[PDB]
Design a protein around this nucleic acid. Sequence first.
RNA 1: GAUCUGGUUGAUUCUGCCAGUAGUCAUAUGCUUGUUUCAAGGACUUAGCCAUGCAUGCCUCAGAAUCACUGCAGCAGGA
RNA 2: GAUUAGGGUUCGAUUCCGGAGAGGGAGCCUGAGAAAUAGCUACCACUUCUACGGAGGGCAGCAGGCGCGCAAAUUGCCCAAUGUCAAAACAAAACGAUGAGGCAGCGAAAAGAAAUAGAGUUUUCAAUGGGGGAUAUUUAAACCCAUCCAAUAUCGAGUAACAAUUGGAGGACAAGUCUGGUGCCAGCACCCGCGGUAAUUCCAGCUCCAAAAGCGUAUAUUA
RNA 3: GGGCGUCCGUGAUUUUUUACUGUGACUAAAGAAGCGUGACUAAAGCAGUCAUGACUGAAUUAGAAAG
Lengths: 127, 182, 260
Amino acid sequence: FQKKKAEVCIRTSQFKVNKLLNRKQFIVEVNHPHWCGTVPTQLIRKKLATLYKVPDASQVSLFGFKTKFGGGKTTGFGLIYDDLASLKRFEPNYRKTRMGFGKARLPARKSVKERRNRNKKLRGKAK
Amino acid sequence: MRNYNNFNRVWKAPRRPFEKERLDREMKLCGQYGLRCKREIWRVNMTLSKMRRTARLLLTLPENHPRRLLEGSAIMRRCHEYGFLDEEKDKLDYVLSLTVPDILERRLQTIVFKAGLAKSVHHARVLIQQRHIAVAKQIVTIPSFIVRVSSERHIAFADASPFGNGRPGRVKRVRAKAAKRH
Amino acid sequence: AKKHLKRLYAPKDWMLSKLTGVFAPRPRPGPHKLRECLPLLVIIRNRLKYALNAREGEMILRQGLVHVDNHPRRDGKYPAGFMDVVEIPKTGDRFRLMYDVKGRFALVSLSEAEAQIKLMKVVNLYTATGRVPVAVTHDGHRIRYPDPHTSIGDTIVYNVKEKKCVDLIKNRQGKAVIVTGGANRGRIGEIVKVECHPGAFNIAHLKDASGAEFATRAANIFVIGKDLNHLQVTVPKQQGLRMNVIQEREERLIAAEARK
RNA sequence: GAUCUGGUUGAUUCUGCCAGUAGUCAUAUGCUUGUUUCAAGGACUUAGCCAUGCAUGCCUCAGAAUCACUGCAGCAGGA
RNA sequence: GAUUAGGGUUCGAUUCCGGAGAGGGAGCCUGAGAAAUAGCUACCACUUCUACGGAGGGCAGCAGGCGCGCAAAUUGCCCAAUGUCAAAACAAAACGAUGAGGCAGCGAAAAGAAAUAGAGUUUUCAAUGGGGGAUAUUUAAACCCAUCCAAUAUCGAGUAACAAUUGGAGGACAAGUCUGGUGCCAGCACCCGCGGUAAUUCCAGCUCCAAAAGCGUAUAUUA
RNA sequence: GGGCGUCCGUGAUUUUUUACUGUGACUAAAGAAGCGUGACUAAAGCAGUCAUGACUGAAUUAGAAAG
Ligand SMILES: [Mg+2]
Ligand SMILES: [Mg+2]
Ligand SMILES: [Mg+2]
Ligand SMILES: [Mg+2]
Ligand SMILES: [Mg+2]
Ligand SMILES: [Mg+2]
């Protein structure tokens, strides 16, 4: 054993440019020996930003990772769009909400179900 | 309810549960290979029984038949791959001569005893299950892991284990905390 | 009126995994049969990975970005089947639906000149109102004034841009077919002898390029050229030649060992 | 694995059943249960009876807006 | 599906396909398609609100409730995925509906993998889970699992008390001519048989055997 | 300009089936058999594997009688 600062190196396996939806899609595997815990998605986002030279580091989209048994590495899917305005357009709301910017959650669906059943009786401008 | 994930049984209990000849052989096999229960022997029975049954069907089939050239070269391939048969044994009549200790020698509990990484076969089963042995820089925590022939070269201590190049384990580390408060 | 497919009752050539959801996209009526098509949601999501789910998949289709036979198809459930030409102008790739020799659908990449024509087999002939004799095709087309030598078993070359039947291929002894049904589906062969048996199914005997003899029903054969060299359309990478199951099993082990 | 074994007699050969035995994605029950993975789950009796909530609704650039609705300075959202 | 050398013998309410039904029984309208039932009309059997004039009900949908039984869970979260519908791509003041379907809670039905220790000279040395937790990761959101006890800097086994049980020890059938008690009693025993004051069989203590996170028993059913 | 011999459809001429058996043609998945593949092993699953993208894989076989 020899103590050194825990280094993250990052690798992209099967890369694809998607001219539809305006993005570059791929799976990204992170090797993190001597790391403590799991690498955060935010820290993978900036290091994948430098490797592809994207102008804004927040236009990278990184969702579900699966850490390998035994440790040492993770592997998840990656998305980098041509524009950040294209990111807010084509990403789902749940991946936007995990990036901060996104629509706040609707009222609980059990409430909107009951109100809509109450309005089935009415006719005028009351509903 | 609409779930189509499959599952079957891997072992079978013997007919005649009290045979004094059988009960003596299986206590030797639990001692010479460090086994938890008789059920780990009984799946090695069913693993080898299924090989002994398919290879006995293929000998009913003639040579230069399609189901014997294909799928008879598959069962000789997995014996050579997992160390069940050495490379001279290529005639398919040697699968009918395989024994239960021929399969039990290929478990990761046995090779870690035979390669020399542990003093006893009960030392090997502890060190597998306590995350010390990596087969191909892959920490394997399963004692019934059947080691291939090509995997024998690369069994070593894990790179994250305290016995390898990892951080020191619990009894040193909780002692290193007690010497720190003083 | 069925509106649902279960993913187990879906065709096996689509290759949808049984553990991902109960349902499969039931293809609408249209050109091709439900048992014998590949709907555009499976092509855009499962064949091509342009879409990760069905929600990204209708962002492509409803926007008007996939063209099946020169016309944009905004339906994820549109039945695309055999001999169809799927263009995409943005990614600049265009494909043809062919059967490969294992019977599955295969996307054969095309040029611009090869992507204008398609080959279509007559299924019925009748006279419409007026005295116009129209030809009914397996892709649902109704060509109104076909070549007067058109019979039912024949093949019309069509050119989907300028909707003009440019050619005809008769169904005779000396022609080469592709088999589009049965155990022999995807195989290409010369025609040897066609056994008539009126009142029942015509049987067609066929010989392959290697010399392998095999038979089908003559409603399953689809004539695609004058001979096996002069095929009118390009075929997948095996070119209708079915290798042995032992020999093709040996070659993958040899290729996997030689790769490492 | 194309396998049986106790029980009729003072002992012996049989016939023949009872009994053991091993399965069940076959149910129920009893005593126990530290970790994980994968799962069935009011079918059987009563297609018996049902409190309450919910389970089928749809709007785009592209059918109909004078809300006495909303911003904005007629254009947009629209119940 | 279960079992099966071969021939067979059984089970199939249940996920896929088809048929039928929506409390029983009819009869219809509308529509391309219904003899539709989270459509209508009527009667029969039950049934809820009423200001007595009247008005309604249909869980063999999903949760639940009472009964019935030997016998079967949450009045849970969500459309993120799979799909269906449709005037409908996503986004922009600007999120279509879905008890279909997922997800989680209960869950020893049945299946996989697997701890309860190792190593050495009375006496020490190492281990790492169960379990606590995170810069976090998963996830629609959590959960789980996976990864981690510094990366400058993360808690922890000793009777490891963090403690294995369930059935047996005459025979079949593996394993006591051990000790105490009772005395054809109490009980055991699938069958044969035990027990009548020295019980290989009961009630117990010890010690063993078998399977083991399992193991008895009962009823079906195959060998 | 004759012979030879085919193809297709139509007329006229006096009749032999069935079981069996060999080959075919058609015959949904899930399930069974099994070919690949270190999901850590396995029960699984159809996936993945390798140094601004490459070779892609999902092989195959049994499935009652009748037609
Ligand atoms: Mg560790
Ligand atoms: Mg049904
Ligand atoms: Mg009645
Ligand atoms: Mg219910
Ligand atoms: Mg005594
Ligand atoms: Mg006793």
